[PDB]
Structures are given as structure tokens and as C-alpha cells.
Subunit: 134 residues, 2 copies
């Protein structure tokens, strides 16, 4: 329930995006959506410190016009609650590259052929204080 | 016709906002709107290099729910077309403080008693690549 929303970000492939923010002291739930339309998101992040009864578990999936989405499961968490961290996100038509402030890199195939990113929304226990383009 | 739009910026008085961007090579028209609702903007900027037949002329006014607005006229332009520049904007309930990358400072009374900024939109010949909070 805490994250700024952006629009008109028209991001093309081959560009790097860096976001620096501060994770609340109670990092329990986060929601991210970066695509073009609300139901047409290319990437979705939803880490959960402890919801039903799990720990440091991350869910990642994509949606097309509210159709479906290949939701996977990532079990890596190089961050702690109440800690400032930056995440590098690169969206390319060939594939998606994402790196953490302290970890390796993970790529996800972009079944969609979107060449521009126009929708970017984030709301959760994470606080974004600045957005940088390339 | 070129400027990203932001939302959920809930900015309180006593905070400084810095925006770094790049002005297109044809800096002819710019539009800015920072308030809470589309018709409830507290500050509006609209510099015009040459429209009807004027030069480096800036118009500044405020609106409340689409009611009225004390539009004034500022004739200062410490910038050139095709040039990167940063502008510091501070919104306080006592008054509004605005400084340019190379110039003095100008304050405008905020007849409205808005304690938080939730709407921020900019579209024109200026390009914003990063937004920084305090």
C-alpha cells in the first residue's frame, strides 16, 4: 500500500533503468507492474516475506490484456527489511535482464513483442524516492 | 507533446524536489501541472520561445477545481534550447520557493492551503530523464 505510479515512460529495448528507493522496516508485501496497459504488463514482481506461511519467496509472471501469464518462482532475497536498495531493470525484445544490488542475474523470455514500455506502477512495503533513466 | 506524468507523489511542505532533464533542441513550448487533481493544480508553468510573436516569455498561474487562477508574467530565461538543465522546486504552505540552475529565486503565494502534492504532470519540448525526492 505504498509505491508511486508512473506513466508515459515509453522505454525502448537496449536501454537500462535504475531505481533507488527505501524498503519499509516491515517489508512484507510488494507489487510491481511495468508494461503498457493495466492488463498488458510484461513483468510483475510480488515478493512476500510471510503471507500464508512462507518466507523470502518471490513470484514473477507476465500478463497480456488480462489473458494468462507464465508465473514462475524465484527463491533469492539479497535484501532485508528497513534497508535502502537499488534494482537495475533492462527490458529488451530479445529477453529481459534483471540484476539485484547483491546477487546474480536472471533472464525471462518476453513472449510478447512489445517494443516500448508505457505503464509502470509499484505499490507495497517498498518506497521509491527517485527514478533514473539509462 | 513530450513529458512524463507522475502520480501518488504525496509531497508535504518543507520538502525539496529536484528534477534533472534535457530540453529538446526546439524548446518552443512546455506545460507543467503539479497539484492534487487535474483541475486543482497549485502551480502551472508555460514558457514560450515564440508562439503568437513573442520571445523568452513565461506564464505562471494556479487553478482550483477549474475555478480561476492568478496568472502572472515572468520574463527570465536562464536556459537555451537543446541544453540539459535542472530546476529545484519546493512547495511549502507558507509560500512556494522555486530556483533555476542559473538565476535568482521567485516566490508565489499559495492561496490554497493544500498540505500534500499528489498530481504532477509535464508535457512539452522538455524531456525529464530522472526525478529526485528531497
Amino acid at each position: 500500500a505504498c509505491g508511486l505510479v508512473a506513466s508515459n515512460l515509453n522505454l525502448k529495448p537496449g536501454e537500462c533503468l535504475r531505481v533507488r528507493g527505501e524498503v519499509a522496516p516491515d517489508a512484507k508485501s510488494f507489487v510491481l507492474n511495468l508494461g503498457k496497459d493495466s492488463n498488458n504488463l510484461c513483468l510483475h514482481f510480488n515478493p512476500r516475506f510471510n503471507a500464508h506461511g512462507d518466507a523470502n519467496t518471490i513470484v514473477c509472471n507476465s500478463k497480456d490484456g488480462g489473458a494468462w501469464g507464465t508465473e514462475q518462482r524465484e527463491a533469492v532475497f539479497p535484501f532485508q527489511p528497513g534497508s535502502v536498495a537499488e534494482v537495475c531493470i533492462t527490458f529488451d525484445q530479445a529477453n529481459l535482464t534483471v540484476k539485484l544490488p547483491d546477487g546474480y542475474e536472471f533472464k525471462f523470455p518476453n513472449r510478447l513483442n512489445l517494443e516500448a514500455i508505457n505503464y509502470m506502477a509499484a505499490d507495497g512495503d517498498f518506497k521509491i524516492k527517485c527514478v533514473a533513466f539509462d
